[PDB]
């Protein structure tokens, strides 16, 4: 199947200002996005805001202003946010968007006809912070902010309430089997591989119905109503979920506003996603309660969840109140965009907490980015070591220039396997493998000498080295997509050879080609004191 590669992230509530979680996971979707628009497929990378419920409508009764207003003003922030971060991400979907409202109105009219929703009742513990029902064993005794005595949920420690009311709701229990069968039918459907063990036990072990309703006055009127019947409105979850039917259903024209919604996904070819990405603390929501609706509505599933873990600081929670803040422009203004892209990417695989310490953001910028990369594009187009400012003809290869040649073909490869798990930290660790052999191999040869001694064999050292950082820029333009403009720039290849899997391959620029011009005194990556 050719079909345009749909990824997404989240759609986040809008509570609060945007903090980094949302620019980590938003980061994900766009790096992936990225990647497969530099492989020459067609990409549709769909971020967004989760504006109803009781939740964000009780956070704009707190600052007493109209939900209409709150949200507006809070989407505007998130919007900024992700301007300011140097996304390319194809639409930006909010869930008070007219057009999302009749999509939803679509699925849940859809799961009613299938015979999947009755009139119940839900009688349970719910955080509402979570938006999440829970079961006795996921709450657990702590403090509410009065430090009076209440429950708190084990997930995730905010304060949860007793629910008892008339609910319409979804048959769950009746999907239990379909699951099963779709999670060992699609063995890497779910990423990292313990997160989907995790799944699947707790599918093996039953599930309950779910309420996909609520009582109206209970969610201060900010939600959708249920086709029907006007005192309910449906449960948010179901509501938000659905953004990526209605994202893969919408024509978006150069500006990124939304002119047209399509009657069926096939008309866009983007439905049902080839990655969502999200954190692990949305797991269930993704992987069981998303397919269940999918599979009684009649629709096709997604090929990948991928669920990331939780960022701290200094070792510590990450919070303002708490006095530890971590502020992603701040931090990118004084380290720069790219590198601070770079270093929450490979700082942290997707199965850990990740951690930030100036220490150590400090300690990759100066170790891989200047010492390693940065070093070796200067190296390589520097007037003393490249005195014809241009790629030269190589002469014969020895042994030593083949086993670097080999390591060269052999990236885009395994490059390519790890982008698609994904697994992105394993893709830059595996690029920057073959950079530290190139400089190992420059450092062998030692070219500077040789500019003097053997012109003949420094064409044959020059070409290959320009030839490594050429291929492993390519691979890396997803994580440093505006300082692979600028080596690219450098080395001056041409335009059609910074895409396309054509130009995954060995020898795609050919000798002659001359070098960009230099800037007097300009560096790729400038070292930072150890502060
Ligand atoms: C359909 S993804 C919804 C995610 C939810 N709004 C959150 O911030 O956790």
Redesign the pocket.
């Known amino acids: 199947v050719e079909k345009v590669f749909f990824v997404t992230s989240?759609?986040?509530?809008v509570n609060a200002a945007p903090h980094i979680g949302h620019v980590y996971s938003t980061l994900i979707t766009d790096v992936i996005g990225r990647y497969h628009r530099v492989k020459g497929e067609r990409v549709f990378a769909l971020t967004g805001t989760?504006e109803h419920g009781q939740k964000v409508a009780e956070a704009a009764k707190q600052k007493q202003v109209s939900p209409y207003d709150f949200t507006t003003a809070v989407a505007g922030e998130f919007k900024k946010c992700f301007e300011q971060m140097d996304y390319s991400i194809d639409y930006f979907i909010r869930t008070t968007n007219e057009q999302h409202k009749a999509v939803v109105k679509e699925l849940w009219t859809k799961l009613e006809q299938k015979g999947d929703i009755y009139l119940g009742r839900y009688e349970g513990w719910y955080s509402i912070s979570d938006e999440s029902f829970l079961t006795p064993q996921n709450i657990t005794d702590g403090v509410d902010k009065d430090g009076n005595p209440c429950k708190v949920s084990l997930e995730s420690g905010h304060v949860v309430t007793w629910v008892s009311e008339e609910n319409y709701m979804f048959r769950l229990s009746a999907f239990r089997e379909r699951l099963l069968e779709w999670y060992h039918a699609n063995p890497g459907c779910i990423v990292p591989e313990f997160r989907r063990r995790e799944v699947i036990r707790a599918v093996e072990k039953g599930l309950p119905d779910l309420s996909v309703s609520r009582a109206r006055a209970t969610l201060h009127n900010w939600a959708i109503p249920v086709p029907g019947n006007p005192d309910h409105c449906v449960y948010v979850?179901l509501d938000?979920?659905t953004?990526?039917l209605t994202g893969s259903r919408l024509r978006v024209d150069e500006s990124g506003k939304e002119v047209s919604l399509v009657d069926d996904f096939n008309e866009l070819e983007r439905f049902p996603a080839d990655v969502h990405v999200?954190?692990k603390?949305?797991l269930k929501?993704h992987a069981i309660y998303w397919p269940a609706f999918l599979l009684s509505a009649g629709l096709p599933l997604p090929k990948k969840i991928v669920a990331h873990g939780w960022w701290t600081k200094d070792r510590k929670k990450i919070s303002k109140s708490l006095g530890n803040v971590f502020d992603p422009v701040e931090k990118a203004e004084e380290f720069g965009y790219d590198a601070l892209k770079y270093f929450l990417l490979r700082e942290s695989g997707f199965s850990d907490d990740g951690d930030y310490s100036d220490k150590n953001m400090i300690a990759r910028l100066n170790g891989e980015l200047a010492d390693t990369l940065g070093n070796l594009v200067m190296r390589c187009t520097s007037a003393k070591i490249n005195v014809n400012g241009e790629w030269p003809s190589p002469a014969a290869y020895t042994e030593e220039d083949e086993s670097l040649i080999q390591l060269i073909k052999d990236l885009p490869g395994t490059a390519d396997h790890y982008y698609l798990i994904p697994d992105i930290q394993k893709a830059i660790i595996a690029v920057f493998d073959v950079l530290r052999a190139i400089n190992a191999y420059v450092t062998d040869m030692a070219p500077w000498k040789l500019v003097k001694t053997d012109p003949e064999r420094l064409r044959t050292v020059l070409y290959i080295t320009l030839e490594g950082v050429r291929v492993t820029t390519l691979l890396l333009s997803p994580i440093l997509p505006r300082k692979s403009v600028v080596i690219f720039d450098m080395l001056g290849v041409p335009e059609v050879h910074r895409k396309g899997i054509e130009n995954f391959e060995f020898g795609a620029v050919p000798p002659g080609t001359r070098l960009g011009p230099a800037v007097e005194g300009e560096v790729l990556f400038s070292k930072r004191s150890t502060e």
């Open positions: 989240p759609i986040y509530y989760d979850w938000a979920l953004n990526y999200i954190g603390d949305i929501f």
